[PDB]
Amino acid sequence: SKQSWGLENEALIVRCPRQGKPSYTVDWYYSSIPTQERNRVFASGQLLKFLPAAVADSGIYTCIVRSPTFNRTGYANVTIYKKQSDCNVPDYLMYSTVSGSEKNSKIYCPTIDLYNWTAPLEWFKNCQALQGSRYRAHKSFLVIDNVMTEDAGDYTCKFIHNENGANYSVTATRSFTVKDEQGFSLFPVIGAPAQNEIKNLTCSACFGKGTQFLAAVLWQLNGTKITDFGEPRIQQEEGGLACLDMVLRIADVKEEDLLLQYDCLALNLHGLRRHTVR
């Protein structure tokens, strides 16, 4: 059961929520639907098509996929709108997308996969057709190399879905956000310790320049986190440099503490680095 939307005069294809194959066989219903070409609204396989969509067409359109070792069934909540000459696409179309300055350039045109398009498409930032050097559009996306914090805005792409040779107009809009700093990262590096003996202990490792999706330094004990007397116990901290640290704590030494490894670890998406103390 998945929602879908679009304007009047525009083509809209809608995929059936429960998935399956060609030769698995799908049916659609409104409020028993044309399988090919009742000339405006009809359904080909998993794809409910509206050519073009009108507001009257809003409703729930249920669908059923049949194996027949099963009949899976799933619905499409659907709404079609009147363009308001606001010139500003209202907050309901698609979803926000970020980028670096020159550091990431790419805005994808939503839902385009659903449609049949052999052409180069048009982009518009807040009712202003893009052009020139800085904006260069290719395939299904838009590449902006110029990007400042100035390219924040709602980008809308128009393209054409062609059916039997009938051309229809489709558009989609989404917001674009510029990432303040885009930093790098590499395999983690443990400043402290080296492989070494102690006889209050600490581990610091360093993962890159930026702010990491995933960076963690953590203490393992005999290669597990959890074997316990009242101690060991683990504690953290935080400081264009990006590095993390974790401190062990042990108040009272005991004998067991001689045998088995105290393992500092730093991990990343790049992988894991471990050091051993004793």
């Binding site: 907050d91 179309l93 926000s96 997308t97 670890l265 998406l269 992988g271």
Partner: protein, 137 residues
């Protein structure tokens, strides 16, 4: 025995979100553009250490979409499936991580080489070898 476990959003090269849906008996997995401010399905990546090297040893991971379910990789059928299995997790639940540019990752089957979770016809499937494209959040 995972080393750490964190939630992250999943998304493709072209920025489609990978959503999960559990009809609680069977399921669906979507690769599709969401609506602004619609929250994204977060999945638990649990990170284990492969002896697969790097520079060192690179991680693998298992993804719980939710509440005691994981991503099982179906070999001959080139598919991703969802399983319950309280039991200690099997080899098709595991994926060697790979990292090229930032956050941009691909998942290779611990069991059978050169086969990655990837995307085909707007569905999630397995690929034998740019269509293995995942961002995290």
């Amino acid at each position: 025995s995972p080393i750490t476990e964190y939630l992250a959003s999943l998304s493709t090269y072209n920025d489609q979100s990978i959503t999960f849906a559990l009809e609680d008996e069977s399921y669906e997995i979507y690769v599709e553009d969401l609506k602004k401010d619609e929250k994204k399905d977060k999945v638990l990546l649990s990170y284990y250490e492969s002896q697969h090297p790097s520079n060192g040893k690179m991680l693998m991971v298992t993804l719980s979409p939710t509440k005691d379910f994981w991503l099982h990789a179906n070999n001959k059928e080139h598919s991703v499936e969802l399983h319950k299995c309280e039991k200690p997790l099997p080899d098709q639940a595991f994926f060697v991580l790979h990292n090229m540019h930032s956050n941009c990752v691909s998942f290779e089957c611990k069991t059978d080489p050169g086969v990655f979770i990837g995307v085909k016809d707007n569905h999630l499937a397995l690929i034998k070898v740019e269509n293995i494209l995942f961002k995290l959040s």
